Amino acid sequence: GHPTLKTPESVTGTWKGDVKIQCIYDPLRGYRQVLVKWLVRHGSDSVTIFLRDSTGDHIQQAKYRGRLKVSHKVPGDVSLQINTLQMDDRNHYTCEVTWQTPDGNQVIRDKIIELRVRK
Amino acid sequence: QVQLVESGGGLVQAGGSLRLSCAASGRTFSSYGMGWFRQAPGKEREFVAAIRWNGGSTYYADSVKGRFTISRDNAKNTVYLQMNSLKPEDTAVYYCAAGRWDKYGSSFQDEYDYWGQGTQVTVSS
């Protein structure tokens, strides 16, 4: 491993507005992106809210349906956008990327970003 | 942001035990995985142990598996390294580190943004 995940320490969005949680990296030769995960904190663990694999994007909860968009045009930009922020969206979010190397083995890396919601 | 201060290093007999502490300033502690690294004379810095933000999920280097534990006081924003059955080859400067990894990469130096001064631990034969 690996390409470096660039993220902010915190992000602040507006209640019922939209926010974009930055997770971007420069693609590297020898690291093929095979999985992207966004997770949220729940108690003493994290829970997957979004998965992107070979069959596309999967929001793992109806509450997020239509609310979650992960960037998919500029390579290495897998930033999370949340539509119409709820106060309950205040949380620690995690961006998690899996790269596959020429070995066929896989390198997982992740980053935690705090989301604050105002108004 | 995080400023890290180690403490508790010193002299210790072989077979002995020693607990290192590391105070982390800042108010975003819960975003950071914490880790201990060490660097011996004439050798490159290596991973010792790490602990997730939750304060219970831990990771160890094979060289200290079974001997060392890592713990974390999330309220005091502190982490500790309990060492046991110390050998001369554990002699090194030990570093407290913090990074915003969640579950993964805790064994790699490049995943930590913030580093303490390091504290000296010497294990006499």
Coordinates of C-alpha atoms in Angstrom, one line a residue, chain A:
Chain A
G1 CA 0.0 0.0 0.0
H2 CA -1.0 2.6 -1.1
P3 CA -2.4 5.9 -2.4
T4 CA -2.9 8.5 0.3
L5 CA -6.5 9.2 1.4
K6 CA -7.0 13.0 1.8
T7 CA -9.8 14.0 4.2
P8 CA -10.7 16.9 6.5
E9 CA -10.7 16.3 10.2
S10 CA -14.2 17.8 10.4
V11 CA -17.0 19.1 8.2
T12 CA -20.0 21.3 9.0
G13 CA -23.3 21.1 7.1
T14 CA -26.5 23.0 7.4
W15 CA -29.7 21.4 8.8
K16 CA -31.9 20.3 5.9
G17 CA -29.2 21.5 3.5
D18 CA -26.6 19.4 1.7
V19 CA -23.0 18.6 2.6
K20 CA -20.0 17.0 0.9
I21 CA -17.6 14.9 3.0
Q22 CA -14.3 14.9 1.1
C23 CA -12.5 11.6 0.5
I24 CA -10.0 12.0 -2.4
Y25 CA -6.8 10.3 -3.4
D26 CA -4.4 10.3 -6.4
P27 CA -4.6 7.0 -8.2
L28 CA -1.4 4.9 -8.2
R29 CA -0.1 2.4 -10.6
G30 CA -0.3 -1.1 -9.0
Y31 CA -3.4 -0.2 -6.9
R32 CA -6.7 -1.0 -8.6
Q33 CA -9.7 0.3 -6.7
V34 CA -12.1 -2.7 -6.1
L35 CA -14.2 -1.4 -3.2
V36 CA -15.4 1.8 -1.6
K37 CA -17.2 2.0 1.7
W38 CA -18.7 4.8 3.7
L39 CA -19.5 3.9 7.4
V40 CA -21.0 5.7 10.4
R41 CA -20.2 5.3 14.0
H42 CA -22.7 3.4 16.2
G43 CA -21.6 2.9 19.8
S44 CA -18.3 1.1 19.9
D45 CA -18.2 0.1 16.2
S46 CA -18.8 1.5 12.7
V47 CA -21.6 0.4 10.3
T48 CA -21.6 0.4 6.5
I49 CA -24.0 2.9 5.0
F50 CA -22.7 2.8 1.5
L51 CA -20.9 0.3 -0.7
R52 CA -19.6 0.6 -4.2
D53 CA -18.5 -2.6 -5.9
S54 CA -18.6 -4.2 -9.4
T55 CA -22.4 -4.1 -9.5
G56 CA -22.4 -0.3 -8.7
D57 CA -23.6 1.6 -5.7
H58 CA -25.6 0.2 -2.7
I59 CA -27.1 2.3 0.0
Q60 CA -27.5 -0.1 2.9
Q61 CA -30.5 1.8 4.5
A62 CA -33.7 3.2 3.1
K63 CA -33.2 6.3 5.3
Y64 CA -30.2 7.1 3.1
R65 CA -32.0 6.3 -0.1
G66 CA -31.7 9.4 -2.4
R67 CA -29.7 11.1 0.3
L68 CA -26.3 9.5 -0.4
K69 CA -24.2 10.3 -3.5
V70 CA -20.6 9.3 -3.8
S71 CA -18.5 11.0 -6.5
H72 CA -17.8 8.8 -9.5
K73 CA -16.4 10.9 -12.4
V74 CA -13.0 12.2 -11.4
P75 CA -10.8 9.2 -10.6
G76 CA -9.8 8.8 -6.9
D77 CA -12.6 11.1 -5.7
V78 CA -15.0 9.0 -3.6
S79 CA -16.4 12.0 -1.6
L80 CA -19.7 11.5 0.2
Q81 CA -22.6 13.9 -0.3
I82 CA -25.5 13.8 2.0
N83 CA -28.7 15.4 0.8
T84 CA -31.0 17.2 3.3
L85 CA -29.1 16.9 6.5
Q86 CA -30.9 15.6 9.6
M87 CA -29.7 16.5 13.1
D88 CA -29.3 12.8 13.6
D89 CA -26.7 12.8 10.8
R90 CA -24.2 14.4 13.2
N91 CA -21.7 11.6 13.5
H92 CA -18.2 10.3 12.8
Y93 CA -18.2 9.1 9.2
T94 CA -15.5 6.8 7.8
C95 CA -14.2 6.6 4.2
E96 CA -12.8 3.2 3.4
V97 CA -11.1 2.2 0.1
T98 CA -9.9 -1.2 -1.0
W99 CA -7.2 -1.5 -3.6
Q100 CA -6.0 -4.7 -5.3
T101 CA -2.3 -5.1 -6.1
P102 CA -0.7 -7.1 -8.9
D103 CA -0.3 -10.0 -6.3
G104 CA -4.1 -10.3 -6.3
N105 CA -3.9 -9.4 -2.6
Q106 CA -5.8 -6.4 -1.2
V107 CA -4.9 -3.3 0.7
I108 CA -7.6 -1.6 2.8
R109 CA -7.2 1.9 4.2
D110 CA -9.6 4.3 5.9
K111 CA -10.1 7.7 7.4
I112 CA -12.5 9.2 10.0
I113 CA -14.3 12.5 9.4
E114 CA -16.5 14.2 12.0
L115 CA -19.7 15.7 10.6
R116 CA -21.2 18.6 12.4
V117 CA -24.8 19.9 11.7
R118 CA -25.7 23.5 12.4
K119 CA -29.0 25.6 12.5

